[PDB]
Amino acid sequence: KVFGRCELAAAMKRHGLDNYRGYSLGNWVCAAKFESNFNTQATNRNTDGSTDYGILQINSRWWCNDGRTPGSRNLCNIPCSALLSSDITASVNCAKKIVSDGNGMNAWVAWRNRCKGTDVQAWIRGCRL
Ligand SMILES: [Br-]
Ligand SMILES: [Br-]
Ligand SMILES: [Br-]
Ligand SMILES: [Br-]
Ligand SMILES: [Br-]
Ligand SMILES: [Br-]
Ligand SMILES: [Br-]
Ligand SMILES: [Br-]
Ligand SMILES: [Br-]
Ligand SMILES: [Br-]
Ligand SMILES: [Br-]
Ligand SMILES: [Br-]
Ligand SMILES: [Br-]
Ligand SMILES: [Br-]
Ligand code: NA
Ligand SMILES: [Pt+2]
Numbered sequence: 509k510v511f512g513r514c515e516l517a518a519a520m521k522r523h524g525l526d527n528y529r530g531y532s533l534g535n536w537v538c539a540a541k542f543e544s545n546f547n548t549q550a551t552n553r554n555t556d557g558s559t560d561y562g563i564l565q566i567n568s569r570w571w572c573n574d575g576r577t578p579g580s581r582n583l584c585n586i587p588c589s590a591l592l593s594s595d596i597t598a599s600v601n602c603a604k605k606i607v608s609d610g611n612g613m614n615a616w617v618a619w620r621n622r623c624k625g626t627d628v629q630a631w632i633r634g635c636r637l
Contacts, residue, residue, distance in 0.1 A: 513537065537632060542619070574588040
């Protein structure tokens with residue numbers, strides 16, 4: 509599923525991401541924009557053999573099981589495929605674990621390089637929230 513901007517903002521809010529670990533909704537929407545362009549089915553293979561999955565490009569080295577990332581863990585206790593669903597529940601639940609891991613949203617390299625410190629409220633501007 510390719511979400512609209514305000515559609516995804518509303519779904520992220522429903523699932524409790526607005527201000528989660530202190531990160532306003534606009535941060536999460538911005539992260540999703542640059543990670544997946546709002547596409548739940550996005551995947552990206554990394555050089556280390558791991559793969560990133562879904563709207564927030566969550567990685568198989570620590571967070572999900574894809575059966576092909578040697579030495580990896582599955583801390584969200586899910587198949588990585590769950591992260592590609594039109595229903596963002598698994599991605600949101602797992603993101604909450606990631607952002608609590610100590611480095612905050614810096615865990616998303618695209619958030620750090622493209623969202624951090626910017627006017628992130630622009631990402632939710634106009635939306636019925
Ligand atoms: Br779609
Ligand atoms: Br957009
Ligand atoms: Br929109
Ligand atoms: Br919704
Ligand atoms: Br919910
Ligand atoms: Br915001
Ligand atoms: Br594996
Ligand atoms: Br293994
Ligand atoms: Br594990
Ligand atoms: Br599994
Ligand atoms: Br949803
Ligand atoms: Br959720
Ligand atoms: Br879940
Ligand atoms: Br933080
Ligand atoms: Na894994
Ligand atoms: Pt939820």
